[PDB]
Amino acid sequence: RAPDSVDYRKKGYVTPVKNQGQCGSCWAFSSVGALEGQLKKKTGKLLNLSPQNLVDCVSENDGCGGGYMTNAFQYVQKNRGIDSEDAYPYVGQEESCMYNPTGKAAKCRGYREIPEGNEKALKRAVARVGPVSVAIDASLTSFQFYSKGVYYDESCNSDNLNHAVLAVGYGIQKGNKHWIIKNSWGENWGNKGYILMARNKNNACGIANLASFPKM
Amino acid sequence: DTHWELWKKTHRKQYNNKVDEISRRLIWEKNLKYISIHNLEASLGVHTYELAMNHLGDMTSEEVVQK
Ligand SMILES: *[C@@H](N)N(C)N(C)C(=O)[C@H](Cc1ccccc1)NC(=O)OCc1ccccc1
Ligand SMILES: [Cl-]
Numbered sequence: 001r002a003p004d005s006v007d008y009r010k011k012g013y014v015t016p017v018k019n020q021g022q023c024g025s026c027w028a029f030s031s032v033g034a035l036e037g038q039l040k041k042k043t044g045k046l047l048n049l050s051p052q053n054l055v056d057c058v059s060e061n062d063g064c065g066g067g068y069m070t071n072a073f074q075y076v077q078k079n080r081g082i083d084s085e086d087a088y089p090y091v092g093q094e095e096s097c098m099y100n101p102t103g104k105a106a107k108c109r110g111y112r113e114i115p116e117g118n119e120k121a122l123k124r125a126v127a128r129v130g131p132v133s134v135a136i137d138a139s140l141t142s143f144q145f146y147s148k149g150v151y152y153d154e155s156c157n158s159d160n161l162n163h164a165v166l167a168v169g170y171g172i173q174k175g176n177k178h179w180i181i182k183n184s185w186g187e188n189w190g191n192k193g194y195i196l197m198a199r200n201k202n203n204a205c206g207i208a209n210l211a212s213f214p215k216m
Numbered sequence: 217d218t219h220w221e222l223w224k225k226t227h228r229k230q231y232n233n234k235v236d237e238i239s240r241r242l243i244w245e246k247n248l249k250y251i252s253i254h255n256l257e258a259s260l261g262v263h264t265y266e267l268a269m270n271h272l273g274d275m276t277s278e279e280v281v282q283k
């Protein structure tokens with residue numbers, strides 16, 4: 001039997017790794033990643049969407065001071081769209097909202113929340129829906145300098161969620177189950193910008209504590 | 217400081233003054249040693265993952281996630 005494993009990069013549902021830089025826009029990268037996967041699923045086109053659009057225009061969030069992916073999805077729904085990266089390029093600092101409906105590249109019909117702490121529910125969503133926005137504890141030096149392998153540090157605090165990233169699949173490496181996680185710290189972090197995070201290790205780093213995905 | 221210079225230049229790092237630069241160098245040195253010890257532990261089966269120096273080398277792990 002083939003293993004049960006999913007990797008949306010292989011199916012063309014994931015854009016290249018971005019670098020958020022100095023700006024606290026992890027939430028905006030996580031949100032556009034989730035929207036990028038649903039757009040690919042809906043329309044067959046893979047397109048970079050605008051994190052800057054979210055940073056400048058999601059008034060329920062705090063731009064470079066941080067925010068929630070759920071508030072981003074609600075903004076795209078209420079706004080009746082989000083711009084392409086091309087129509088609204090990333091400058092890595094908050095500016096006046098300059099949304100332009102002519103650059104619109106995606107829409108949103110709401111969002112779904114994964115039940116708190118339920119890694120099997122997150123797995124079913126990745127498998128059946130696509131890339132899912134997730135929040136983790138990324139506060140450890142072991143995460144800061146992750147290079148390769150399956151990240152599992154017992155000091156990780158599932159109740160200390162301080163970073164937003166994108167689950168793009170799941171699998172197993174050298175007998176260690178993992179989530180495939182796209183980060184937004186550039187391709188010089190991790191494995192070309194990715195980290196494998198321990199799966200079914202009692203919700204390691206709070207991976208399934210605040211997971212959400214947009215409806216399209 | 218050959219390696220520290222190449223690291224600063226490669227990552228376009230600037231500091232406000234000598235005290236700030238030496239403070240940052242000290243964090244980086246401590247992180248290099250942490251990386252070396254972790255990877256030695258990983259070679260002995262202690263960890264399922266390995267570390268490497270990157271553009272966040274001169275920062276605390278809290279600073280990376282909490283501006
Ligand atoms: C990341 N670059 N950065 C500043 N972070 C950590 C955030 O934006 C976090 C991400 C996050 C999402 C879900 C759960 C935990 C963490 N969000 C954040 O700090 O939100 C603060 C906020 C301010 C104003 C309005 C809403 C939220
Ligand atoms: Cl959120």
Ligand SMILES: [Mg+2]
Binds near residue numbers: 139140141276277278
């Ligand atoms: Mg630390």
